[PDB]
Write an enzyme that holds these catalytic residues in place. Structure first.
Site, PDB file in Angstrom:
ATOM      1  N   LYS A 278       0.681  -1.307  -0.141  1.00  0.00           N
ATOM      2  CA  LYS A 278       0.176   0.289   0.008  1.00  0.00           C
ATOM      3  C   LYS A 278       0.906   1.171  -0.027  1.00  0.00           C
ATOM      4  CE  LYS A 278      -2.192  -1.062   3.597  1.00  0.00           C
ATOM      5  NZ  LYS A 278      -1.523  -2.452   3.772  1.00  0.00           N
ATOM      6  N   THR A 279       1.709   1.208   0.935  1.00  0.00           N
ATOM      7  CA  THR A 279       2.671   2.455   0.946  1.00  0.00           C
ATOM      8  C   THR A 279       3.336   2.686  -0.133  1.00  0.00           C
ATOM      9  OG1 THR A 279       2.976   2.511   3.378  1.00  0.00           O
ATOM     10  CG2 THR A 279       4.434   3.479   2.313  1.00  0.00           C
TER      11      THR A 279
ATOM     12  N   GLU B 228      -3.391   6.203   1.330  1.00  0.00           N
ATOM     13  CA  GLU B 228      -3.119   4.848   1.749  1.00  0.00           C
ATOM     14  C   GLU B 228      -4.290   4.362   2.728  1.00  0.00           C
ATOM     15  OE1 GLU B 228       0.626   3.453   3.483  1.00  0.00           O
ATOM     16  OE2 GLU B 228       0.201   1.637   4.309  1.00  0.00           O
TER      17      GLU B 228
HETATM   18  C1  LIG Z   1      -1.692   1.072  15.085  1.00  0.00           C
HETATM   19  C2  LIG Z   1      -2.122   1.441  13.585  1.00  0.00           C
HETATM   20  O1  LIG Z   1      -3.433   1.226  13.243  1.00  0.00           O
HETATM   21  N1  LIG Z   1      -1.086   2.025  12.805  1.00  0.00           N
HETATM   22  C3  LIG Z   1      -1.333   2.308  11.631  1.00  0.00           C
HETATM   23  C4  LIG Z   1      -1.676   3.628  11.064  1.00  0.00           C
HETATM   24  O2  LIG Z   1      -0.580   4.606  11.854  1.00  0.00           O
HETATM   25  P1  LIG Z   1      -0.688   5.818  12.950  1.00  0.00           P
HETATM   26  O3  LIG Z   1      -0.440   7.048  12.209  1.00  0.00           O
HETATM   27  O4  LIG Z   1      -2.139   5.687  13.332  1.00  0.00           O
HETATM   28  O5  LIG Z   1       0.182   5.316  13.964  1.00  0.00           O
HETATM   29  P2  LIG Z   1       1.629   4.339  13.896  1.00  0.00           P
HETATM   30  O6  LIG Z   1       2.463   4.814  12.751  1.00  0.00           O
HETATM   31  O7  LIG Z   1       1.404   2.941  14.177  1.00  0.00           O
HETATM   32  O8  LIG Z   1       2.299   5.043  15.160  1.00  0.00           O
HETATM   33  C5  LIG Z   1       1.512   5.185  16.322  1.00  0.00           C
HETATM   34  C6  LIG Z   1       2.185   6.314  17.012  1.00  0.00           C
HETATM   35  O9  LIG Z   1       1.418   6.492  18.170  1.00  0.00           O
HETATM   36  C7  LIG Z   1       2.191   6.702  19.220  1.00  0.00           C
HETATM   37  N2  LIG Z   1       1.850   6.136  20.422  1.00  0.00           N
HETATM   38  C8  LIG Z   1       1.506   4.591  20.710  1.00  0.00           C
HETATM   39  C9  LIG Z   1       0.974   4.352  21.920  1.00  0.00           C
HETATM   40  C10 LIG Z   1       0.735   5.447  23.033  1.00  0.00           C
HETATM   41  O10 LIG Z   1      -0.063   4.947  23.996  1.00  0.00           O
HETATM   42  N3  LIG Z   1       0.915   6.802  22.880  1.00  0.00           N
HETATM   43  C11 LIG Z   1       1.350   7.199  21.640  1.00  0.00           C
HETATM   44  O11 LIG Z   1       1.614   8.273  21.262  1.00  0.00           O
HETATM   45  C12 LIG Z   1       3.641   6.121  18.826  1.00  0.00           C
HETATM   46  O12 LIG Z   1       4.848   6.787  19.403  1.00  0.00           O
HETATM   47  C13 LIG Z   1       3.486   6.523  17.443  1.00  0.00           C
HETATM   48  O13 LIG Z   1       4.110   7.573  16.924  1.00  0.00           O
HETATM   49  O14 LIG Z   1      -1.770   3.992   9.720  1.00  0.00           O
HETATM   50  C14 LIG Z   1      -0.940   3.781   9.107  1.00  0.00           C
HETATM   51  C15 LIG Z   1      -1.176   3.923   7.519  1.00  0.00           C
HETATM   52  O15 LIG Z   1      -2.124   3.202   7.179  1.00  0.00           O
HETATM   53  C16 LIG Z   1      -0.253   2.443   9.210  1.00  0.00           C
HETATM   54  O16 LIG Z   1       1.162   2.345   8.776  1.00  0.00           O
HETATM   55  C17 LIG Z   1       0.034   2.032  10.652  1.00  0.00           C
HETATM   56  O17 LIG Z   1       0.516   0.908  10.958  1.00  0.00           O
HETATM   57  C18 LIG Z   1       1.689   0.966  11.684  1.00  0.00           C
HETATM   58  C19 LIG Z   1       2.784   1.713  11.539  1.00  0.00           C
HETATM   59  C20 LIG Z   1       2.211  -0.394  11.977  1.00  0.00           C
HETATM   60  O18 LIG Z   1       3.002  -0.731  13.020  1.00  0.00           O
HETATM   61  N4  LIG Z   1       1.700  -1.595  11.386  1.00  0.00           N
HETATM   62  C21 LIG Z   1       2.140  -2.892  11.454  1.00  0.00           C
HETATM   63  C22 LIG Z   1       3.350  -3.258  10.984  1.00  0.00           C
HETATM   64  C23 LIG Z   1       1.495  -3.407  12.768  1.00  0.00           C
HETATM   65  O19 LIG Z   1       1.277  -2.893  13.638  1.00  0.00           O
HETATM   66  O20 LIG Z   1       1.327  -4.611  12.767  1.00  0.00           O
HETATM   67  N1  LIG Z   2       2.965  -6.335  -4.020  1.00  0.00           N
HETATM   68  C1  LIG Z   2       3.633  -6.625  -2.980  1.00  0.00           C
HETATM   69  N2  LIG Z   2       3.523  -8.068  -2.394  1.00  0.00           N
HETATM   70  C2  LIG Z   2       4.088  -8.581  -1.458  1.00  0.00           C
HETATM   71  N3  LIG Z   2       5.101  -7.890  -0.717  1.00  0.00           N
HETATM   72  C3  LIG Z   2       5.308  -6.582  -1.094  1.00  0.00           C
HETATM   73  C4  LIG Z   2       4.512  -5.950  -2.101  1.00  0.00           C
HETATM   74  N4  LIG Z   2       5.239  -4.552  -2.268  1.00  0.00           N
HETATM   75  C5  LIG Z   2       5.993  -4.463  -1.194  1.00  0.00           C
HETATM   76  N5  LIG Z   2       6.294  -5.855  -0.456  1.00  0.00           N
HETATM   77  C6  LIG Z   2       6.898  -5.917   0.580  1.00  0.00           C
HETATM   78  O1  LIG Z   2       6.195  -5.464   1.646  1.00  0.00           O
HETATM   79  C7  LIG Z   2       7.103  -4.581   2.459  1.00  0.00           C
HETATM   80  C8  LIG Z   2       6.097  -3.393   2.866  1.00  0.00           C
HETATM   81  O2  LIG Z   2       5.465  -2.810   1.597  1.00  0.00           O
HETATM   82  P1  LIG Z   2       4.584  -1.440   2.012  1.00  0.00           P
HETATM   83  O3  LIG Z   2       4.422  -0.966   0.769  1.00  0.00           O
HETATM   84  O4  LIG Z   2       5.079  -0.610   3.275  1.00  0.00           O
HETATM   85  O5  LIG Z   2       3.256  -2.589   2.290  1.00  0.00           O
HETATM   86  P2  LIG Z   2       1.899  -1.900   3.191  1.00  0.00           P
HETATM   87  O6  LIG Z   2       0.809  -2.446   2.395  1.00  0.00           O
HETATM   88  O7  LIG Z   2       1.970  -0.363   3.212  1.00  0.00           O
HETATM   89  N6  LIG Z   2       2.303  -2.390   4.627  1.00  0.00           N
HETATM   90  P3  LIG Z   2       1.433  -2.080   6.103  1.00  0.00           P
HETATM   91  O8  LIG Z   2       0.984  -0.481   5.878  1.00  0.00           O
HETATM   92  O9  LIG Z   2       2.232  -2.027   7.260  1.00  0.00           O
HETATM   93  O10 LIG Z   2       0.164  -3.097   6.080  1.00  0.00           O
HETATM   94  C9  LIG Z   2       8.142  -3.987   1.475  1.00  0.00           C
HETATM   95  O11 LIG Z   2       9.138  -3.612   2.166  1.00  0.00           O
HETATM   96  C10 LIG Z   2       8.419  -5.288   0.644  1.00  0.00           C
HETATM   97  O12 LIG Z   2       8.961  -6.381   1.656  1.00  0.00           O
HETATM   98 MN   LIG Z   3       1.803   0.970   4.657  1.00  0.00          MN
HETATM   99 MN   LIG Z   4      -1.036  -4.117   7.363  1.00  0.00          MN
END
Ligand SMILES: CC(=O)N[C@H]1[C@@H](OP(=O)(O)OP(=O)(O)OC[C@H]2O[C@@H](n3ccc(=O)[nH]c3=O)[C@H](O)[C@@H]2O)O[C@H](CO)[C@@H](O)[C@@H]1O[C@H](C)C(=O)N[C@@H](C)C(=O)O
Ligand SMILES: Nc1ncnc2c1ncn2[C@@H]1O[C@H](COP(=O)(O)OP(=O)(O)NP(=O)(O)O)[C@@H](O)[C@H]1O
Ligand SMILES: [Mn+2]
Ligand SMILES: [Mn+2]
Length: 463
Positions: free
Chosen positions: A119-120, A163
């Site tokens: 997605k990102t 996203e």
């Molecule tokens: C928890 C969740 O739903 N996070 C998703 C959301 O991002 P969002 O902007 O809400 O926050 P985030 O990037 O997770 O960061 C959380 C922020 O809250 C802060 N934080 C956390 C706990 C708390 O008690 N207080 C606080 O202030 C952290 O320091 C951090 O700065 O929307 C983003 C865009 O769609 C996603 O990338 C993101 O996934 C995060 C980054 C993530 O870790 N994803 C996967 C890897 C996962 O959690 O398994």
């Molecule tokens: N099309 C794809 N299929 C499978 N893996 C991918 C794909 N694109 C990227 N990746 C892998 O996934 C990782 C995360 O990609 P990213 O674009 O951040 O996905 P995302 O959907 O945004 N993740 P998230 O927001 O945490 O649910 C990359 O660093 C690659 O390892």
């Molecule tokens: Mn993402």
């Molecule tokens: Mn995810």
């Protein structure tokens, strides 16, 4: 301009340093709203917001919500957060991050990017194509767009590229004109009560947010997405390597870390693509991007220029540099991949660029729940590297689950007998451990979604 959201003077963000939260905050700051926020951590993101005029508090306290017209909350925030509890007590509107994203989208032409992986990346690509097309888009990406040096940008057009997170099902707030779904595999399964059918149903509901005339762009190579097509009830355009794809990829070749391929369009138009990022997975992402752009009527040159010069998203196959170590010259690459599929495609892309020299991985598992749910798949995928350093699980707020930790992963990987992993629980020893197991020409993958990127940064700066 569009009138201000009624009576909205100050918008307070709980978790403002978040990847999605920060961008929303920056858009609204630049639209003229007073912004306040709290975060448990101070970093580059909160410092940037503070310098731009956001009132930023580090740590949580009920006084921090003073003046707020509305409180926007990251799903990372606990139910007992003092700011959250006080906001509800004072009857200040409290909304999810994605609901505020939805408000940014409301009067805009929304292109929402959903799916399990990519997605990102895809959002960054579409954002850059629309920028190249001189369409001046607003975008809110869940990660750093390298050509922007930030996650989000306020444009003067009506376009919004955003996203759309399914992890908490919050993307249901969004009302886009075009929705991309890159793929669908089990992740975040706790939200869906471990039921993949509930995830499928939720994505269908999401697509049903499209207007009757709206467009769903879906990966043809994903059998789950293809099975779901009859349920969408909107125009579906597909992309991928599949013979059935509306935008079909052919003749993919990776040279170094660039991809070369042809895309065949629905009208049989053939487009030769140079993609500045590696791997078939990125060709897929870039073809989602190309498909959206073509369906919008964007000219080929803009699409191709943006893809040829695509600088990537931060932490996504992100080259940190080359370093001369006592045991040889190495390349350090940071990657966000945290699901077995993502780790898999990243390893493969690295292999197709490197060739003769080794893939060394530093893997940090993200979440105990994820480790538990996909344990066997992690074991299989992590056994595909040449050398493996395992870091402890990045908890991400989760209490440890028995048998779902890095020690358990190491034991199971060791049992497969392909690689013998080294667990590094003390990350201050990581540099020394690496230097002992490093060979000349190694590609080192710093792999995971947690603090592994911070750790790899500190390693790179020390080198
Ligand atoms: C928890 C969740 O739903 N996070 C998703 C959301 O991002 P969002 O902007 O809400 O926050 P985030 O990037 O997770 O960061 C959380 C922020 O809250 C802060 N934080 C956390 C706990 C708390 O008690 N207080 C606080 O202030 C952290 O320091 C951090 O700065 O929307 C983003 C865009 O769609 C996603 O990338 C993101 O996934 C995060 C980054 C993530 O870790 N994803 C996967 C890897 C996962 O959690 O398994
Ligand atoms: N099309 C794809 N299929 C499978 N893996 C991918 C794909 N694109 C990227 N990746 C892998 O996934 C990782 C995360 O990609 P990213 O674009 O951040 O996905 P995302 O959907 O945004 N993740 P998230 O927001 O945490 O649910 C990359 O660093 C690659 O390892
Ligand atoms: Mn993402
Ligand atoms: Mn995810």
């Amino acid at each position: 301009i569009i009138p201000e959201m009624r009576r909205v003077q100050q918008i307070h963000f709980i978790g403002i340093g978040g990847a999605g939260m920060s961008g929303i905050a920056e858009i609204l700051l630049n639209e003229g709203y007073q912004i306040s926020g709290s975060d448990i951590a101070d970093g580059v993101v909160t410092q940037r917001l503070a310098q731009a005029g956001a009132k930023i508090y580090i740590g949580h306290a009920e006084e921090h919500i003073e003046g707020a017209s509305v409180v926007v909350v990251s799903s990372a925030i606990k139910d007992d957060n003092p700011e959250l509890v006080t906001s509800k007590q004072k009857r200040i509107p409290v909304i999810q991050r994605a609901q505020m994203l939805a408000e940014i989208m409301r009067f805009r032409h929304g292109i929402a990017v959903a799916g399990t992986h990519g997605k990102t990346t895809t959002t960054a690509m579409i954002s850059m194509i629309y920028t190249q097309a001189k369409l001046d888009p607003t975008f809110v990406n869940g990660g750093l767009v390298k050509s922007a040096g930030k996650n989000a940008h306020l444009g003067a057009s009506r376009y919004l590229i955003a996203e759309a997170d399914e992890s908490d099902a919050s993307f249901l707030h969004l009302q886009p004109m075009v929705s991309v779904v890159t793929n669908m595999e089990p992740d975040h399964m706790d939200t869906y009560e471990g039921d993949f059918e509930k995830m499928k149903a939720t994505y269908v509901k999401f697509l049903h947010n499209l207007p009757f005339y709206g467009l769903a762009v879906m990966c043809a190579d994903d059998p789950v997405l293809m099975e779901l097509v009859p349920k969408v009830g909107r125009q579906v355009i597909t992309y991928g390597f599949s013979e059935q794809a509306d935008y079909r990829i052919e003749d993919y070749e990776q040279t170094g870390f660039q991809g070369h391929y042809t895309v065949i369009c629905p009208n049989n138009e053939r487009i030769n693509v140079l993609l500045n990022v590696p791997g078939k997975h990125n060709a897929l992402n870039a073809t989602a991007a190309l498909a959206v752009a073509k369906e919008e009527g964007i000219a080929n040159e803009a699409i191709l220029e943006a893809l040829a010069d695509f600088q990537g998203a931060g932490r996504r196959f992100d080259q940190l540099g080359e370093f001369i170590r006592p045991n040889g010259k190495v390349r350090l690459v940071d990657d966000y991949g945290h699901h077995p599929t993502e780790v898999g495609v990243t390893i493969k892309a690295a292999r197709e660029g490197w060739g003769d020299k080794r893939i060394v991985m530093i893997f940090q598992p993200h979440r105990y729940s994820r480790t538990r749910d996909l344990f066997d798949d992690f074991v299989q995928v992590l056994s595909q590297v040449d050398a493996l350093i395992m870091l402890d699980v990045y908890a991400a707020g989760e209490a440890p689950i028995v048998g779902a930790d890095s020690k358990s992963l190491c034991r199971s990987i060791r049992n497969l007998g392909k690689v013998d992993p080294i667990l590094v629980s003390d990350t201050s020893q990581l540099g020394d451990v690496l230097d002992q197991i490093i060979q000349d020409g190694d590609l080192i993958l710093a792999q995971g979604a947690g603090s592994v990127s911070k750790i790899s940064r500190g390693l790179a700066e020390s080198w």
